[PDB]
Amino acid sequence: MWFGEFGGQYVPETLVGPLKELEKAYKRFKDDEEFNRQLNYYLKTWAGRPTPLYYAKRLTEKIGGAKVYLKREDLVHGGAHKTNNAIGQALLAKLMGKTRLIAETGAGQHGVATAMAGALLGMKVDIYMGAEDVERQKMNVFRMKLLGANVIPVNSGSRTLKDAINEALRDWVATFEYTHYLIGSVVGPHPYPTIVRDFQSVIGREAKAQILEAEGQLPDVIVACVGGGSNAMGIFYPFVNDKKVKLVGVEAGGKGLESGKHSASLNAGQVGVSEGMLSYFLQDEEGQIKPSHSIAPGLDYPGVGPEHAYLKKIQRAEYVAVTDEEALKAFHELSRTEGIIPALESAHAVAYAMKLAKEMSRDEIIIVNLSGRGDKDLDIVLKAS
Amino acid sequence: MWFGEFGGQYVPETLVGPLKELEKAYKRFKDDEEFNRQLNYYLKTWAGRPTPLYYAKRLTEKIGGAKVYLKREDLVHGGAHKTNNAIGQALLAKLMGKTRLIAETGAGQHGVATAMAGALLGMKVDIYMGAEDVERQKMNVFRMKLLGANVIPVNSGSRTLKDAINEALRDWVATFEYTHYLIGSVVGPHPYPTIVRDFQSVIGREAKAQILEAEGQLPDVIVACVGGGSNAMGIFYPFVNDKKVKLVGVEAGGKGLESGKHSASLNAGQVGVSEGMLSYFLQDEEGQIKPSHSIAPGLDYPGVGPEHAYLKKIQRAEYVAVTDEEALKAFHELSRTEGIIPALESAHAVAYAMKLAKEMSRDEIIIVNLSGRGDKDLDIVLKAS
Ligand SMILES: N[C@@H](Cc1c[nH]c2ccccc12)C(=O)O
Ligand code: NA
Ligand code: NA
């Protein structure tokens, strides 16, 4: 419920009941033998876990500083960390006796992850999507249909994510008995931020074994991009009780923090209650929540996860930002130098890691979370160049 | 050089020296401890090998016959089996003392795999693509550009694959001193058929181990799509001396075997010399090379590898055809039932495995080679729908 001062269940009473039933179910299963047999089985044979830790010999040498390892979540089925959470929640839903999954997306990336997992486990999938976002993302709409998901287009309101979240939360309230609401990131009302981190913490447990195998010591610094902060919490959480290990989140700097068009909640954001949780959001002079901007659609969220806010206060994790032009720089450089086309989201985490590598010694170690592959971001990089 | 009565080195005197150099270098490195350590290292940390063996429960249960396992080559870095051979030959070329890679691509897949391998190993990469293909494949061209390769667009002749192969031979004859020619299937003069199969046999080695751990016994049938036959030779070769393991290759049935618009060289082809090898090719009344057809670009090749001609003559493998229609259903059915979007190439193997499974016992095992993921084929299945 509470990561220090941040978190909670700040929702209407009609949602409070379901969330308690989810809370009760998650407790029963999260340590159950058969739930973890099934989950680990699918994560292995379907998703292709474990994912490798890659030493970037060329990139490390070009910089001349600390050794740069890349945790390759780009190689997971679907091409993003998002799959670990979708399988977990979709399986939990199946054992809870649910027959249907709902989710929300504008990009399409989380609906595809939700669709894939629904099809795996033989559940119905309805994905609420704004009619504006549908036109702009026709291939992810087609993917979802190919996967047997129903995309319900939302012509009510601004026809965007906001209205799709409203139409979706409306559905869950009614249908919770048989339907599960699969949340993308470590955001929203408890218990969602806890469950999503628990299903993404496989990244760090693997990274830990793999860096101790590769180098015979824990890493000096771990870098991860932060939209809502599922992948960062994934690769952070198991290294939390290792004081030596510095955790760095990279938010979207956008055009610049002084410019207004950014998504850096933990930098220039203010404490509020939105979308079920108490955390940092982006706000103007008045109390209103402002639009966010990032060239990476994944980092384009005004909010940040409550656990990341908690980690920023106690100074266990620093939180920095990277410009769109710096991210595109690192997108091109990793492609040329490692033959790995990263996600624009992961391009941010890369961009900083190269800066931090120069300043550190060749004996030292940087692990960078490569959250996904950039096949989905090829159009955006073309237009930008 | 010869697989029974098939294979050879049908090339000009100008290419005998380069190929002899390659064969001698290959003899030297193929069993070298360091080459194999370095190759296995790139395959693990960069490609994400091993790939899982996935039991398709819902598909298996829907047909009501044999267990259907998918070998998940779709999960390898780059999204196809082609990566295995691309790393292999690039690492061979580097340790030979070559500084440059040249390749022919039509569809662009082998171009991207060569470009990726190039970046990894820090070698120059010039890819020869028909200028007509460059217009059709904007993403793959941009991908190769990002990955630090030059696409050398070829404007001479038909502006197609044939003309790119010739100007890539012309290139090699001159530059072979510092250049390796990276062939992307088990075709062309010796020693290419041997080398490409050696670098793809990792697929079968992993699959033998995985099905023995999983089921405690060898598969009853192994099914792979056959264009040139590299992914097929790859999963077949380790099982050849296992007499009770049936091998089935699935060529492109196209619009139908009686239509004359297909790529089923082994079913409806004649023995003769083309592209430097004695194998089966599609021939007209004259005996000149007939154009081929498949909805899957990777199967759209009038010829087939000499080792597949050999396995057919000794009746060790059975070779069948699946139509564009049957593959399309396969593409849709797997996406909906297992949440895996296969390549149109691999959808041929899935299509035939589903037919075979219905006829067989629930206790019997089929391994299908899922050679790639269907992201690249989404435009063509949308047009078809
Ligand atoms: N996808 C590859 C397929 C390919 C390359 N070389 C081949 C030789 C034989 C058969 C198929 C191929 C391409 O770019 O076209
Ligand atoms: Na944010
Ligand atoms: Na063929």
Swiss-Prot record, chains A, B:
Substrates-to-products reaction catalysed: (1S,2R)-1-C-(indol-3-yl)glycerol 3-phosphate + L-serine = D-glyceraldehyde 3-phosphate + L-tryptophan + H2O
Keywords for the protein's UniProt record, in alphabetical order: Amino-acid biosynthesis, Aromatic amino acid biosynthesis, Lyase, Pyridoxal phosphate, Tryptophan biosynthesis
A GO term for molecular function: tryptophan synthase activity
Sites bearing N6-(pyridoxal phosphate)lysine, chain numbering: 82
Pfam (any one): PALP
UniProt superkingdom: Archaea
Pathway: Amino-acid biosynthesis; L-tryptophan biosynthesis; L-tryptophan from chorismate: step 5/5
The protein's required cofactors: pyridoxal 5'-phosphate
GO cellular component, one term: cytoplasm
HAMAP family: Trp_synth_beta
Protein family: Belongs to the TrpB family.
Functional note: The beta subunit is responsible for the synthesis of L-tryptophan from indole and L-serine.
Name used for this protein in its record: Tryptophan synthase beta chain 1
Species of provenance: Pyrococcus furiosus (strain ATCC 43587 / DSM 3638 / JCM 8422 / Vc1)
